[PDB]
Amino acid sequence: VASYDYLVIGGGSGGLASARRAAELGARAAVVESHKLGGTCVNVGCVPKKVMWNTAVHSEFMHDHADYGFPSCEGKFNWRVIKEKRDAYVSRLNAIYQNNLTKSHIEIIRGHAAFTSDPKPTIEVSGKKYTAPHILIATGGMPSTPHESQIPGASLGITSDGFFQLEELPGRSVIVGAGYIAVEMAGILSALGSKTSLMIRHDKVLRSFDSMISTNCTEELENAGVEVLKFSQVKEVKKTLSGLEVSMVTAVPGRLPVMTMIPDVDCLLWAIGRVPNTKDLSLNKLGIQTDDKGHIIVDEFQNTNVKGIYAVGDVCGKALLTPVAIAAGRKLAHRLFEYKEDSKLDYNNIPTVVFSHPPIGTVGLTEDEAIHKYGIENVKTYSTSFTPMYHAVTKRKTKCVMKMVCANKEEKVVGIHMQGLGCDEMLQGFAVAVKMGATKADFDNTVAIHPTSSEELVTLR
């Protein structure tokens, strides 16, 4: 039984970030990883997605070429070219991350970890045992898929994992779900030329975002050529002569349900959520608490119910974002190895960007959330809607919507929501201001930057 100061299960964002900070603090740490370092972010998430987004962004801009005085650009996108360059870039990152571990003197134990029956918390990887007074579980999650028992043929569809394996642009694609991945992938497939349908259970995407965003985002998708199938769900899938055939039921409220077949589908993409990866950990041998989805339960300090065992990142099922896993893993290293007992991540006011077209940025409370928290009489919003000056000369148009949610008499800024060109890079600094407790006067007292889209946020009336 090899002993360490810190044992980290999972070499993804949260696991790596925690291990590296702990090692800086003098801990002798090892990282157990059964696949590729970098985990979801590097291999099948953030990184490869953003590359594909930049590619779709090129497609849109190229529609505006002639309006801008250039000669029309003629045609066919070649999926394989960018796919190969994307994969290579991912290979570069894996090599970098591995080097980051070695330079920090962190040991990398390759293989699949599982807890043992042993009294003191101990894991087994490939026959060998390892132990530590502090063990971090940061095993992430996986894409959720329907059971064949509920949706026969569900297994003919792919997930975001399978999207990253595609070698050619699918001719006809159908995306199921109404959250981040659905919106992102539909926007990428569509811009690149796939005839795309987005199938959602209600009438709008991103129903947990401020209602201004869910409305605007749904419209922007339609305006971009994405067919949004409202109030619809898959009843069954089957492999026909040439592609898949999707049976769906559409149940608009106030109407009779109607069954439709979608034929000749090349790609069926399930974008219905993620499940925690705790199934094969043998948690129950230590009696570690999980919810009924398999998530590990933790307190505000990332403690599990068992002493000396912690969990961070997607496996805990809260705020499933790379930078959250990293921040939580780092605060945890400071608490453990620098004895900062108050060291923990504040889960309020975490900013997030949805890489749609145009992109969405949001931080803090939606209008309804602030209304519930402070009361209607105490909530004031400001908003604007305009067409970016970029489109002053184009036939194609997109809009920019911004909303500021303020609370109390002081008009404390409790939420910012926006969609528009440039919104991916605009959010970070406002998120700093919101975190510091800015009021509307603080915004208003900042001189604007002209001509930009960002200046609108500081001149709301």
Ligand X SMILES: NC(=O)C1=CN([C@@H]2O[C@H](COP(=O)(O)OP(=O)(O)OC[C@H]3O[C@@H](n4cnc5c(N)ncnc54)[C@H](OP(=O)(O)O)[C@@H]3O)[C@@H](O)[C@H]2O)C=CC1
Ligand Y SMILES: Cc1cc2nc3c(=O)[nH]c(=O)nc-3n(C[C@H](O)[C@H](O)[C@H](O)COP(=O)(O)OP(=O)(O)OC[C@H]3O[C@@H](n4cnc5c(N)ncnc54)[C@H](O)[C@@H]3O)c2cc1C
Give contact residues for ligand X (rule: CB under 6 A).
Answer: 176-182, 184, 200-202, 207, 233, 271-274, 320-321, 352-355
Between 121 and 351, name the residue whose CB sits nearer to its own copies: 351
Nearest CA to 10 among 45, 35, 44, 42? Answer: 35
357 is known as an active-site residue: no
CB-based contact 132:7 (threshold 8 Å): yes
Partner residues linked to 385 by β-bridges: 401
Burial of residue 117, with CB atoms counted within 10 A of its CB: 0-12 exposed, 13-18 middle, 19 or more buried:
exposed
Residue 322 binding ligand Y, by CB under 6 A: yes
Residue 10 binding ligand Y, by CB under 6 A: yes
Residue 358's contacts (CB-CB under 8 Å, 6 or more residues apart) are 220, 398, 400, 419, 420, 421, 423
Q: Give least dist CB 320 to ligand X, A.
A: 3
Is 204 annotated to bind a ligand? Reply is no
Between 281 and 320, name the residue whose CB sits nearer to ligand X: 320
3-class DSSP assignment, residue 12: coil
Is 34 annotated to bind a ligand? Reply is no
CB-based contact 210:354 (threshold 8 Å): no
Is 291 annotated to bind a ligand? Reply is no
Between 60 and 338, name the residue whose CB sits nearer to ligand X: 60
290-303 as b/e: b if 16+ CB within 10 A: beeebbbebeebbb
CB-based contact 295:276 (threshold 8 Å): yes
> 447 is in the binding site of which of ligand X, ligand Y, its own copies, none (Cβ under 5 to 8 A by kind)?
its own copies
Q: Give least dist CB 187 to ligand Y, A.
A: 13
Between 51 and 108, name the residue whose CB sits nearer to its own copies: 51
CA dihedral 371, 374, 380, 383 (to 10 degrees): -50
Q: Give least dist CB 450 to ligand Y, A.
A: 4
Q: Give least dist CB 73 to ligand Y, A.
A: 28
Cα–Cα distance measured from residue 61 to residue 221, given in angstroms and rounded to the nearest whole number: 16
Give the footprint of ligand Y on this chain (CB under 6 A).
9-15, 32-35, 39-41, 45-46, 49, 112-113, 138-140, 160, 181, 277, 281, 313-315, 320-323, 325, 355, 450-451
**Which residues belong to the active site?**
450
Binding residues for FAD: 13-14, 33, 40-41, 49, 113, 314, 322, 450
